[PDB]
Amino acid sequence: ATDVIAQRKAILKQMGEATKPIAAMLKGEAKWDQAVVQKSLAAIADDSKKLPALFPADSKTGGDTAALPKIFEDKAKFDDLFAKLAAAATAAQGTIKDEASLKANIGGVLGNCKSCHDDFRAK
Ligand code: HEC
């Protein structure tokens, strides 16, 4: 075993950064860029496929993590929420093709972030 807590925080930090250009477009502070959006959705999908392998029970007493112990009492649900986000971002690469579809469809993707945080991340 190795520092999976450091690994997973690095990947989730990247996920956070991938949402930044999308938020900027939604705010009207950055112009629509289909390539940038595709890049962010692809990162979100790839990160979500990697994260399921980085939350071992032997790291529940890790010390520098915001992961809640609840994760290990509902692991199937936790794992599947990442699969849900991976599938949402993957579907969004096909459904988000212009600014209008970004505004109509991005919520389905981003809502998964809060859904998991409310149950499994420290506040
Ligand atoms: C559970 C299925 C999750 C999903 C879906 C998403 N996140 Fe999350 N995230 C989760 C946990 C358990 C944690 C704590 C990790 C730890 O070990 O401390 C996080 C953390 C983050 C972070 C902070 C990373 C850091 O630098 O320490 C960010 C920026 C973050 N998460 C972003 C984020 C986004 C943008 C998501 C949706 C696209 C998202 N997370 C989903 C659990 C889960």
Side-chain angles (χ1 to χ4, degrees), residues 33-34 47 65 73 75 86 93 108 119:
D33 184 313
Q34 172 148 207
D47 296 341
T65 172
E73 283 185 65
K75 198 69 183 322
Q93 294 174 220
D119 284 327

Side-chain angles (χ1 to χ4, degrees), residues 4-6 8-20 44 48 51 54-55 59 64-68 71 77-85 109-117 120-122:
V4 285
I5 279 167
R8 72 207 196 191
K9 277 176 144 184
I11 288 161
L12 293 154
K13 177 169 167 50
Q14 309 167 214
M15 271 229 272
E17 297 164 317
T19 68
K20 297 200 188 76
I44 290 166
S48 297
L51 291 154
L54 305 176
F55 289 82
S59 107
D64 53 358
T65 172
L68 302 176
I71 292 170
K77 171 185 174 189
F78 172 84
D79 290 348
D80 293 0
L81 223 318
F82 276 121
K84 174 167 177 191
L85 173 60
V109 182
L110 305 188
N112 284 296
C113 313
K114 184 174 171 51
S115 285
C116 181
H117 296 161
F120 304 113
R121 187 195 178 161

